[PDB]
Every structure is written in C-alpha cells, then in structure tokens.
Amino acid sequence: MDKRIQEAVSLFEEVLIYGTERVIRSVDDPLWREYSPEQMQVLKLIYKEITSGRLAILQGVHKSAISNRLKKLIEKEVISIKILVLTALGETVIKQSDAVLHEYIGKLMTNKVDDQEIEQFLVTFRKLKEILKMN
Template sequence: MDERIIEAVDLFQEVMFYGTERVIRAVDNPLWNEYSPEQIQTLKLISKEEKITSSRLALLQSVHKSAISSRIKKLLQKDLIRIVQTEDRREKLLELTEAGKEVLEQSDKVLTDYIGKLLSDQVEDEEIEQFLIIFRKLKEIIKMDGV
C-alpha cells in the first residue's frame, strides 16, 4: 500500500482524536460542561441525517447499541431530540427538536470560532483551499461507496 495513504489515515485519526481533546480543554464554554462530546456528536449526526434510527447512530459512532441507548435517553430527557413514529410501527426515528438545533448551532459556532482563530495565524488561504478541495472529493468518494 502507498505509504502516503497510510500516513494520511494516521494523520486524519490523530487530528480527530487530539483535536477533539484540545478543543474541549481549550474552549471554556458552558456548553462543554452541560453536554458531552459524544452527545454533541450524536446531535450532529441526527442533524446531518435529519431522521435516523438508533441502529444507524450506533453504526456511525462505532459503538454498541447500549451506549447509543444511554445517549438517546439523556438527549430525550434534555428535550434535544424526539422520537418520530413511522408507518411501520416497529421502526422509530430520531430527529432534533428546536432546542437540539439551538445547542448544535451554539456548538458549531464555538468550534468554528476556535478553529478559525487557531488556523488564521498558522495556515495560509491557499492551504485551506487545498484542504477543502481534498475533503470535498473524499466526501463524494465515500458517499459513492454507499456510506
């Protein structure tokens, strides 16, 4: 396998793992005290999918269904998501409530402001453009692969 691909995967994973940790440690925002990173990620996935099953959430977050059940329960208690019945009574879908959309909007703003500040002095505009081109292409490739 091409060594560059191995390095790219490794770098991507490191940015995800350590980036999340750094943001949580560096950003002093009440949002992080009230909601766990996993809860925010769950809200983000529900937002992206609009309506989603708990099984799909578990798959996307690479966790057991019991972990998703716990997150869903907490988000339901906080009125950030709701359960939507489908025509097939056996299937239940999750969607964001208005409160959930507001929390996600706040989280996105905090993250965008922090990352923007972090990158502004260290990354050139051309590098950001290259990053966007590559990640847009990667997103399309992954979508075509059925994910």
C-alpha cells in the first residue's frame, strides 16, 4: 500500500490517455482518421512480437471481444488469419502511422524536455520493460 506506486501507475495511465487524445486531436494524416490507436496496436504487436488469445491479453481485452475487432482489420486487408499475420498493406500502414506519431511527439517535446531527460527516459524504460516482460 505504497502511495508512490499508486501515483506512479496512475500517472503512467494518464500519460497514455492524454497523449492519445493529444495525438488524435493534433495530427492531420488520413491513417490517423482511418485507424484507431487500438487498431494500430494490433498491427504493431504482429509487426514486432500472435494468436487471438495472446493478442487479447497484451491489449487488455476480453478474449470474447477480440474476434469482431479482428474482423474490421481483415476487411481492411491489413491482417490475415492463417495466427494473425500482417499484409504488405498492414506493414505500410503501421510504418507511416508510426512515422506521423514520432514526428508529432518530437515536435511537441522540442523546447519542453531536454536531451538529458530523453536519454534518461530511454534507460529507465528499457529497465522497466525488462522487469515487466514475462518469459
């Protein structure tokens, strides 16, 4: 019952929600209208790390809900089921979606965080990823 952990986890969740809103409201690209961030997370999971059940757990979704969500991405021909696999279009989509995101966050963070803070964040987050990621 550590107040510091309550606040750390709450802040993490807030940075996700408020960053998500900032990006959706602030970029112009058609892909950031066509594809939700939750859809982009399916594509980036297949790209990097996927069965329907594993996807559900990694996205924090009930297994029962994941079928109907995958249907929309199959209809858009960004994934296929064979495991889930990216199509060439899906790879093209998630690379450009990510480029739009990274360019936008880099321009927002200019003159608000310094190089020292960015470099520290990389070491802190690699460490946190290694703690959390199960074998």
